[PDB]
Amino acid sequence: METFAFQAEIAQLMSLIINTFYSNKEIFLRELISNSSDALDKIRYESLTDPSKLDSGKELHINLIPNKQDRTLTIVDTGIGMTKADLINNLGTIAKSGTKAFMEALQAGADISMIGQFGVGFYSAYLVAEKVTVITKHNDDEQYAWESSAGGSFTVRTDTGEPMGRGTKVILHLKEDQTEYLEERRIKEIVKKHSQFIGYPITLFVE
Numbered sequence: 152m153e154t155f156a157f158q159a160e161i162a163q164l165m166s167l168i169i170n171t172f173y174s175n176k177e178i179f180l181r182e183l184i185s186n187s188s189d190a191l192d193k194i195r196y197e198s199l200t201d202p203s204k205l206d207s208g209k210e211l212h213i214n215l216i217p218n219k220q221d222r223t224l225t226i227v228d229t230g231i232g233m234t235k236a237d238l239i240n241n242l243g244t245i246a247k248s249g250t251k252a253f254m255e256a257l258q259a260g261a262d263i264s265m266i267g268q269f270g271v272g273f274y275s276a277y278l279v280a281e282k283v284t285v286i287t288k289h290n291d292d293e294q295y296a297w298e299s300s301a302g303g304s305f306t307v308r309t310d311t312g313e314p315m316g317r318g319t320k321v322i323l324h325l326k327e328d329q330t331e332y333l334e335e336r337r338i339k340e341i342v343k344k345h346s347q348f349i350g351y352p353i354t355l356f357v358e
């Protein structure tokens with residue numbers, strides 16, 4: 152496991168999100184599903200030039216998996232996935248400029264729900280989660296785990312869990328007062344409102 156520090160302003164935004172009183176927290180799910188959809192778009196588009204891109208798995212889907220025992224909600228997709236370089240460097244570059252623009256907009260009166268426009272919708276996870284674990288497999292790299300509790304640092308390690316073939320799992324370790332997002336009716340309500348026209352099948356697992 153390697154440990155990395157966030158730059159000051161990303162750290163500020165993550166703190167803002169994880170701490171703030173904002174009642175409309177359900178928008179986290181729309182943002183993560185949008186990320187999954189974007190990932191699925193990218194691998195599908197690549198496969199149009201090179202069909203072998205799908206040797207690591209043909210199915211293009213999104214699963215939502217609640218676990219009441221672990222107090223986790225996991226968003227699983229079979230999109231393009233992320234390399235080590237994505238997890239440490241490339242997404243850090245995107246996050247830096249996106250954070251800068253979002254924070255400016257917030258100063259000017261924009262709402263937290265607008266976060267996804269700035270390309271940092273991922274951070275909305277911290278509205279409902281104390282810790283976020285990202286397990287990912289990209290065609291060009293090994294399986295990795297990225298993890299952060301939004302306290303100024305994140306970690307990256309090779310992941311020894313079940314091989315995924317290709318794609319991403321975003322595991323939300325939910326805050327104690329945010330367990331409604333484990334409930335079937337609640338998740339279904341949110342998906343219908345915010346994510347009903349996503350171009351990939353979304354399966355809501357139950358327990």
Ligand SMILES: Cc1nn(-c2ccc(C(N)=O)c(N[C@H]3CC[C@H](O)CC3)c2)c2cccc(-c3cnc4ccccc4c3)c12
Pocket residue numbers: 157158161183186187188189190193228230231232233237238239240242243244246271273285297319321
């Ligand atoms: C920022 C971020 N987002 N995120 C995410 C999630 C799901 C998917 C998914 N479901 O695939 C996804 N996919 C995209 C990958 C890149 C492709 O170009 C387009 C699809 C993107 C992360 C996942 C893990 C980590 C980070 C992160 C955030 N802050 C940092 C700040 C500094 C340094 C590194 C940082 C890394 C991110």
